[model samples]
Target: MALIMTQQNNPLHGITLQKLLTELVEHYGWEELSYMVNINCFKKDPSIKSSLKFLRKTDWARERVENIYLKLQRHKERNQLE
Candidate 1:
């Protein structure tokens, strides 16, 4: 398959989804993040919240969020100017 848009090219490259999410949540609180993503967990009982315990358990939701998270990484790298 052709390379994904934000695969290894992501600024958040070299990091896994779990790591990236943790970093983003820490940098931007879950509440702020929810506004950006509009997800239930991030909107409801959110926290840095925690590991992929819930996310990993859930398939569809986890994939969706993970995809977006990965893209964010690429966006960050592309936008960041030296």
Candidate 2:
């Protein structure tokens, strides 16, 4: 496992892939994710399982997803609303 101090600066600290994808999908919706990433897994009959599998293997997409999640966090933090 990676060190705790190393993760201290991480926006994704303590976040698992499953949890990340679940939250994104629930609030942002597959439609919105598809639009942002322009990927079949996010749009083409999207599901959490399929998206997670694809994102795990596709580094580019995974990076984009993580970035989107960071924005998602900031959005909620700024507005303080769902």
Candidate 3:
């Protein structure tokens, strides 16, 4: 038998940082993201490049963003069942 490795349990596995940020901005907008996370990068002249740099260096901030992304996915799934 062969062993298989899969990312079935990892929601962020296949997603790139760029795609994540883009999707988040599209779903919540920069204004909402700033309010929710309250990060300087998201509020002060936000941009994908700047936010990426900041998030890469800030683990806590990155986790928060990722958690929000997870919630967004869950929210969509819940709505789809309706």
Candidate 4:
């Protein structure tokens, strides 16, 4: 038997922060994300670079974003099963 290491348990694992932000923004747009996360980075003149910078430094906000990403992934999976 071999030890199988995988990202099955980690939704954000191996995913770059930049890609994550871009995908989320594309899915929800800045306005919706701002309202949902209550972050200035997403509210005021949002950009991938700026958002990544803020998210990298802010643990709680980054966690929130990751949680949203996980939820989005789950929703997508459920839809696929249907």
* Whole-model lDDT per candidate: 0.62, 0.79, 0.78, 0.77
Question: Which pairs clash in the backbone of model 3?
Answer: none
lDDT of 3 by residue, 1-82 (tens): 3764443454544897778988999889888777778666788886888888888898788888888888887877432221
TM-scores for all predictions = 0.52, 0.72, 0.71, 0.71
Residue lDDT tens for model 4, 1-82: 3865543465544887689878999887888778778767787776789888888898788888888888788877442221
Off by over 4 Å in 1: 1-13, 32-39, 49-51, 79-82
**Descending-lDDT candidate ranking:** 2, 3, 4, 1
Error of 4 at 78 (Å): 5.2
Choose 1 or 2, whichever is better by TM-score.
2
Give the 10-residue window scoring lowest on summed lDDT in candidate 3. Answer: 4-13
Name the candidate, 2 or 3, with the larger lDDT value. Answer: 2
lDDT of 4 at 71: 76
- In angstroms, the error of model 1 at 79 is 9.6
lDDT of predicted model 1: 0.62
Which has the better TM-score: candidate 2, or candidate 3? 2
Candidate no. 4 TM-score: 0.71
lDDT of 2 at 14: 82
Per-model root-mean-square deviation over C-alphas: 8.7, 8.0, 8.0, 7.6
lDDT of model number 3: 0.78
